Design a binder for this molecule. Sequence first.
Ligand SMILES: *[C@@H]1O[C@H](CO)[C@@H](O[C@@H]2O[C@H](CO)[C@@H](O)[C@H](O)[C@H]2NC(C)=O)[C@H](O)[C@H]1NC(C)=O
Ligand SMILES: *[C@@H]1O[C@H](CO)[C@@H](O[C@@H]2O[C@H](CO)[C@@H](O)[C@H](O)[C@H]2NC(C)=O)[C@H](O)[C@H]1NC(C)=O
Ligand SMILES: [Ca+2]
Ligand SMILES: [Ca+2]
Ligand SMILES: [Ca+2]
Ligand SMILES: [Ca+2]
Lengths: 233, 233
Amino acid sequence: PCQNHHCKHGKVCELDENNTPMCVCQDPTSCPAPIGEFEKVCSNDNKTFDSSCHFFATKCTLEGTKKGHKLHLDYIGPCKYIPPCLDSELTEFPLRMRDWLKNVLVTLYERDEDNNLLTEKQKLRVKKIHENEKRLEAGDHPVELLARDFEKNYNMYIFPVHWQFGQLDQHPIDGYLSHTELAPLRAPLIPMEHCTTRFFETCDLDNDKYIALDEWAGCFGIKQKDIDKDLVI
Amino acid sequence: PCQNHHCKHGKVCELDENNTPMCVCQDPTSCPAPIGEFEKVCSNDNKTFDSSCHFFATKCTLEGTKKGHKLHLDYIGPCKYIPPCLDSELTEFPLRMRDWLKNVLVTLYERDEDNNLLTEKQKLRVKKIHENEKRLEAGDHPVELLARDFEKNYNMYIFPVHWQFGQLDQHPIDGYLSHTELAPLRAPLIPMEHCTTRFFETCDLDNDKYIALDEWAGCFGIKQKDIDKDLVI
Ligand SMILES: *[C@@H]1O[C@H](CO)[C@@H](O[C@@H]2O[C@H](CO)[C@@H](O)[C@H](O)[C@H]2NC(C)=O)[C@H](O)[C@H]1NC(C)=O
Ligand SMILES: *[C@@H]1O[C@H](CO)[C@@H](O[C@@H]2O[C@H](CO)[C@@H](O)[C@H](O)[C@H]2NC(C)=O)[C@H](O)[C@H]1NC(C)=O
Ligand SMILES: [Ca+2]
Ligand SMILES: [Ca+2]
Ligand SMILES: [Ca+2]
Ligand SMILES: [Ca+2]
């Protein structure tokens, strides 16, 4: 009778006295063992957990706690040595990753089949981007080029910038990216990913430790006037 | 700032957002590792836990749960093979263990020095028992003898019967012995200990899975009129 009951990350459904479904913290050892280093995860305390399940099981007991509020999945994989974000790389990061977005969204559209990846309206949006003679092709471009393109193709970035935020705001969906939600942006694929944290600390204007839509958008150069919640969902 | 804050078994003090002490479930791996098999414990699922700390840490996440309400420390030590409680042994159990109490309490008084074991009034009580010509000496006695003594020395059992209950009602102190609190009575020392559960299921009159003082006392033959809470604390 808990089959339909989907408890959030870190918890599981156990029936209480009245045989009613209840969400309690999952036993970290009830999580499946990791297949390889790739299933492991690293917290922001530099402690490699066996898997995000294990991590979220552990972290579950800290709900409400000041310690818990701070406990976060830094990145997927085993805790690795992370190179300090050079002052240089940091200023060049926004441009580097903003382009990365447009290209990811493009390749998603190209890989999409019967909307398995992009919804209807989303595909339409990425379509206008995709088939535009002006669209700068993907490749390792000098920050200068990436910059001139941003001005010369600003409208081409408004959706990609908005999309990524939606893709991340899911733990839970509330319009804010926690340190954990930004974890995907710390994977090796991201350009100068070691700068992700440093950078996003730059975006966290009111320093609440959460990147909100306006901070995120504004951090990527998207005019506050061009921010649109409809583009996120 | 949690130093003074003593959370109950299974939980620990972690500060919440307002730097206020909060009681959250303890991380079972934060428990000290067991010294030897003797530090291990066995649950009623026949699963040997690393230590009561570990067990109570695990069980902590099940508060409220029907599964949790049933999760109990069966006995201290590793899960061993347990011999069935023969009908015979069951009827003879009350007499066997009631005597065991009087003798434990006596030897405690003899081993006491400056009240390290028995409080002041408690010693006085066990003293009147100890130095009484009529007191049946310790030894393996036929159930018949143990019986005749109970009638002939009833007053000599009222305190021992009450004391033991107090010694057990500690998780928490509420006047009820849970399956876990009765664990000490499942150790090898107790006479026909394998009959402990079976027996106490007999005492649990209103079948709530808890042995209350009246059930406990009455189960050992102590008159309902001779039950005294003052003798417990
Ligand atoms: C965080 O923990 C990781 C893993 O224990 C540390 O990474 C190691 O770093 C050293 C050099 O500092 C390298 O030689 C090792 O190869 C790294 N291990 C792995 C698995 O990559 C890291 O240094 C720690 N960082 C901090 C700030 O404590
Ligand atoms: C409960 O678990 C324990 C330990 O796994 C079992 O005890 C073993 O029992 C066998 C015979 O049944 C003995 O040969 C072993 O020596 C015992 N192990 C220990 C550590 O003493 C026990 O049988 C299980 N009981 C049930 C009902 O499942
Ligand atoms: Ca969020
Ligand atoms: Ca913020
Ligand atoms: Ca109790
Ligand atoms: Ca009862």
